[PDB]
Chain A
Amino acid sequence: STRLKIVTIHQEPFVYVKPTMSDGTCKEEFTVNGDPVKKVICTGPNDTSPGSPRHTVPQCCYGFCIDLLIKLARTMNFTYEVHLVADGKFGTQERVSNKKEWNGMMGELLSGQADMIVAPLTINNERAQYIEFSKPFKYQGLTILVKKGTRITGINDPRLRNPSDKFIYATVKQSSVDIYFRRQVELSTMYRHMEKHNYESAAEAIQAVRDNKLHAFIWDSAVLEFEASQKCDLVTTGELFFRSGFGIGMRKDSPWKQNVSLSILKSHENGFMEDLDKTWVRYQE
């Protein structure tokens, strides 16, 4: 038949992206349990600045989502080729004109550029209207990342709910979190503040928090708790204020969707998902 086109996105610890070695292969490294890290060649743009051409280079990808992809491919017996989403975004539906268009991985999947999204992709109503999600491979939610020392109670802190330019907070553009804030009228005051400061990627937002250019970053707890466990100048605050899950994304008429979901459930049940958590997500503190 054909290899499956897998689209993913840079998002540690789910997807790490590193340059290939000179010979074009990926450097062999080992997990914190001493096992070899499984890496795959993933092509992606090497210019990621907005408004710029996106000619791609082979790169190296590994992490929670890559281990999951490998498990899926072996389980259900398909071959694949991985690429990084060209615009660097997860995917929202935006007004164009009276048209609406999907960007990011959502757009690539719907257009046939990808056959499956394997990433920390949040399951929500908006996306589920257009694509099929698997049962969640990861249960998590949203929290807030700040600089150590910064004191805010959480999502109900007056510095968020009654904002000014003295305390800047944000999320990632064209992400499920951007959608969550735009969707809910009760959050519109926060949404209007954030739309002036949203970042192109989680990594840049996290760095901006470290650099005291961003006072609070609202994002996926599975990612923020990992960053906090690794960078001791960063902390999460308020615990989860909303719960969400990540799922494998496929078109509504994929032949793979039943067995992907069954494999996900099997992996939760037999401890495989737990092993991935120990390997990639929770091993530091």
Chain B
Amino acid sequence: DDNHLSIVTLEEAPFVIVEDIDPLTETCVRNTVPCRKFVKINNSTNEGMNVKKCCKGFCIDILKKLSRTVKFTYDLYLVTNGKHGKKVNNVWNGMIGEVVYQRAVMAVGSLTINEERSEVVDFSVPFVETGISVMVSRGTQVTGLSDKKFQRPHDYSPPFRFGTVPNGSTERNIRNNYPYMHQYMTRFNQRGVEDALVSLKTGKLDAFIYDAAVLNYKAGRDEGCKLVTIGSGYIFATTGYGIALQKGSPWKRQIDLALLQFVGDGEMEELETLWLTGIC
């Protein structure tokens, strides 16, 4: 009861991957766990229906392990109000919002720990290292975020074409640290990671700035190993993915010790080889 938790997540392979459930059996099998998604009936009503789906991935494997050792059950659902989390007119949306407004006890996914989020939710210890990296075609001369080509884009002709997926931790960091770069980049906003990789591969974009762990995963699976992260996998603003909990959550301590036990006992290494290993 107090042991059965509402938990929110968000699709982002390979950390969280969503699949359609078997029409029959309507049962999740294999490495997957049940996760529901609220889907609107139409755009003229507030009516919707939870659709039963199945979730798997690195972070889902983490959740299963935490459920086993911290001893809780859960009702996993996919966020529909935004994505990871952004403060809009001083109100948090996304996974962060679900936790802040007490719709979820915790958020599990590719959720980046940062200062402004930590003001409104508590984060577990980081369990996946990440930060901001830059993906380019192999050989592209860029030192890092601080490269003049990004910092002062119009000092070059033609200027470097580079973008991120807006509204997440990466854009927030850039907007705060590099105001001119940021207002320049918005014209190259990408709707999502898949769009961005297509833009890079066909030469519509010179660089894609995004979450380090996801880019390292994409670099590992790239056809031809032609897209790479710069600086031999350099990372600005090193941080990690964390489990977000409500401020003052009584679950935080056990969750932290659990994650640290998984790391210390080498259980994280196998999840990494399992989900995050790539050919390139």
Contacts and interface: CB of A to CB of B under 8 A. Distances in A.
A265 B118 contact: yes
Given A139-B129, A186-B266, A242-B269, 14 more contacts: A124-B260, A125-B260, A125-B261, A128-B257, A133-B125, A184-B266, A242-B266, A245-B126, A262-B115, A265-B114, A265-B239, A268-B237, A270-B177, A271-B237
B168 to A, nearest CB: 14
Given A135-B126, A269-B114, A273-B238, A125 B257 contact: yes
B236 A274 contact: yes
A266 interface: yes
Closest 7 CB pairs of A and B: A125-B260, A265-B115, A125-B261, A139-B238, A266-B115, A268-B237, A269-B237
Q: Majority SS of interface residues in chain B?
A: mixed
Contacts of B115: 262, 265-266, 269
A45 interface: no
Nearest to A126: B264
Interface residues of B, number: 27
Interface string B112-144: 011100110001011001010000000000000
Interface in A60-105: none
A139 B212 CA distance: 14
B265 A184 contact: yes
Interface residues on A, range: 20 to 34
B129 A243 contact: yes
Contact of A129 (B118, B173, B257): B257
A123 interface: yes
6 contacts: A124-B264, A125-B261, A266-B115, A268-B239, A269-B239, A273-B238
Interface in A135-160: 135-136, 139
Contacts of A167: none
A183 interface: yes
Contacts of A186: 266
A204 B125 CA distance: 32
A48 interface: no
A195 to B, nearest CB: 19
A32 to B, nearest CB: 18
Interface in B237-275: 237-240, 256-257, 260-261, 263-266, 269
B89 interface: no
A147 B118 CA distance: 44
Interface in A229-285: 242-245, 261-262, 265-266, 268-271, 273-274
A142 to B, nearest CB: 12
Contact of A183 (B114, B237, B264): B264
Interface in B195-245: 236-240
Contacts of A183: 264-265
B49 to A, nearest CB: 39
B90 interface: no
B266 A270 contact: no
B113 A128 contact: no
B113 A269 contact: no
B238 A123 contact: no
B147 to A, nearest CB: 14
B25 interface: no
B176 interface: yes
Contacts of B257: 125, 128-129
Contacts of B237: 268-269, 271, 274
Contacts of B129: 139, 243
Contacts of B119: 262
Contacts of B177: 269-271
A243 B125 CA distance: 13
A93 to B, nearest CB: 14
Nearest to B265: A184
A128 B126 contact: no
Contacts of A268: 131, 237-239
Contacts of A266: 115
A184 B266 CA distance: 8
